[PDB]
Point group: C2
């Protein structure tokens, strides 16, 4: 009964460190160790589709959420970046580390592994960084929590980083500093990153301690 419909299809799929949404940092560009790639599908896998991206540090990705919801509990859905929304499309700005035919290298990523992507465009500050903009309902995130390491977890993060060819220790630190759950002394918490299970607890309300890294 809709007056108009339009079909979209992914140009590619995200491979990334993130397996669950609550682990994704609220300020992902401050977690550069959160890395991923955009694997492009034909006919978009030739290098000509990307020519000019050498001059661009950041890109917009439009993508599909893994989804009639109008109220979030209460704010209107259009007053939020909630993930269950009309038409199911999200947007994110990510640092472009580099590219080759069929692949973008990304950092500071905030997308789940497997995310279907619909579009890539350059981020352009004069148009996109709006200095006069104000938003009183989006609380900017807390300053960030200190992270210490058990000796075992430091060794395990190193070993798995060497296996994965990823900055695992830095990712863990950058992810945990922004608080990935949902707090209680003693309780062991966990989060998945790449093919790892990372466990931690709160020795004090303002300190996280990494206990172990397994996988």
């Amino acid at each position: 009964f809709e007056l108009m419909t339009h079909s979209v299809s992914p140009i590619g799929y995200i491979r990334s460190c993130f397996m669950e949404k609550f682990a994704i940092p609220r300020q992902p560009l401050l977690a550069p160790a959160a890395r991923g790639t955009l694997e492009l599908l034909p006919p978009f896998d030739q290098v000509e589709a990307l020519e000019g991206l050498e001059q661009v540090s950041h890109v917009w990705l439009l993508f599909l959420f893994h989804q009639k919801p109008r109220l979030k509990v209460s704010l209107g859905v259009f007053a939020t970046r909630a993930t269950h929304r009309p038409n199911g499309i999200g947007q994110s700005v990510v640092r472009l580390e580099g590219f080759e035919a069929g692949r973008l290298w990304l950092s500071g990523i905030d997308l789940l592994d497997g995310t279907p992507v619909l579009d890539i465009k350059p981020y352009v500050p004069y148009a996109d960084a709006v200095a006069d903009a104000r938003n009183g309902i989006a609380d900017a995130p807390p300053p960030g929590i200190a992270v210490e390491w058990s000796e075992q977890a430091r060794r395990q993060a190193h070993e798995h980083g060497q296996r994965l060819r990823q900055p695992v220790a830095e990712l863990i630190e950058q992810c945990l500093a922004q608080d990935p759950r949902p707090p209680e002394p003693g309780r062991r918490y966990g989060v998945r990153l790449w093919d790892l299970d990372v466990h931690w607890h709160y020795p004090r309300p303002d300190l996280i301690r990494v206990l172990d890294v397994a996988g």
Copy 2:
């Protein structure tokens, strides 16, 4: 494994805009505050609960269909209007809203544009002021604009009729240099108007006529 996934989208509403044609739409629309329009929402997205909280939000992202519909030359290195999935994104100033309608300014969308989504602009997440980009995405340098007395009077009378900032919009679009030969006349539609101008000098636009009704 080898069948491309599909996903259907349908507009939540349609733009009513000052802009009827692509020519002269400002490349830096946030410096054209007189570029006004509305987003008319369709049920069930016209219910006021869907907007609760936007009173605290100065700017919104609109996702939209390039409704006028090839791999700065690769398509993914451009903000061109022909994109593989036909979806655009722009940020606009939210002037206000009520049930079923958003009032917008600084827009660059064509009249009739179908909109898929509205998102609040969130500065800590969306403003990367340090980001780098190529020369094809540099802002427009600007050009001087003068007015014939006739065009000044006509813009004023048409602005009163339409209850729109006609003279300001014309100046704000032409100052970004919609670009040229002095004898040629160029024009554009705005609302129900046709506006004409020329270049008496390479560094000067002069507005000649504002017609409509």
